[PDB]
Amino acid sequence: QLTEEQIAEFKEAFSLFDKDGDGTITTKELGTVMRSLGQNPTEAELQDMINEVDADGNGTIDFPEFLTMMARKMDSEEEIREAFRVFDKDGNGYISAAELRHVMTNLGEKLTDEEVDEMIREADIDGDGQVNYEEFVQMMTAK
Amino acid sequence: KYKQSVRLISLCQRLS
Ligand SMILES: [Ca+2]
Ligand SMILES: [Ca+2]
Ligand SMILES: [Ca+2]
Ligand SMILES: [Ca+2]
């Protein structure tokens, strides 16, 4: 009994990587995402990530193999704080609308001001238009 | 989308 909300979240995650919508994630695609996020994995390191979950040996990740990676790859505290540090680029720590838009762009999402504000309304518990660390922790632990 | 986006950042972080 998977829900369609769960399935949609899996789809959305798969699509981040599968830039060409062909249903297969390649080292090229995995690398594209990682570089836009500031990382610099080598081709060989990317291939080793794939090999780990590549059940049919074809060298690329398909949907159920991806679900396998997520099961395996997804320190509660240290993991939430490291993510916060990516969002709160200037370290003040409030995540501004401009900081959120920068992360979202790197996630291949081109957003306007209005849904940036919608995004912020998921976590913002004092209505200052920003997400601070406590609000960030709440958002990650809620329903 | 916000919570889901954080998870996607964390995923790539774990991959590296
Ligand atoms: Ca692809
Ligand atoms: Ca495969
Ligand atoms: Ca900030
Ligand atoms: Ca706030």
DSSP string, A103-122: HHHHTT----HHHHHHHHTT
Q: Which residues surround ligand 4, an ion (CB under 5 A)?
A: A 124, 126, 128, 130
* Chain B closest-CA separation from residue A32 CA (Å): 11
Contact B14, B8 (CB under 8 A): no
Residue A2 contacts by C-beta under 8 Å, 6 or more apart in sequence? none
Structure tokens at A3: 């829900």
Q: Residue ranges per domain, chain A?
A: 3-74, 75-141
Structure tokens at A46: 């990317």
Q: Do A139 and B16 touch (CB under 8 A)?
A: no
Q: Which residues of A touch B1 (CB under 8 A)?
A: 115, 119, 122
A28 Cα–ligand 2 center, Å: 15
Looking only at the bridges linking them, the beta strands covering A94-95 and A131-132 are antiparallel
Residue A143 contacts by C-beta under 8 Å, 6 or more apart in sequence? none
Query: Distance between CA atoms of A75 and A81, rounded to whole angstroms?
Result: 10
Q: What is the resolution of this structure in A?
A: 1.8
Nearest to B2 among A12, A37, A122 (CB): A122
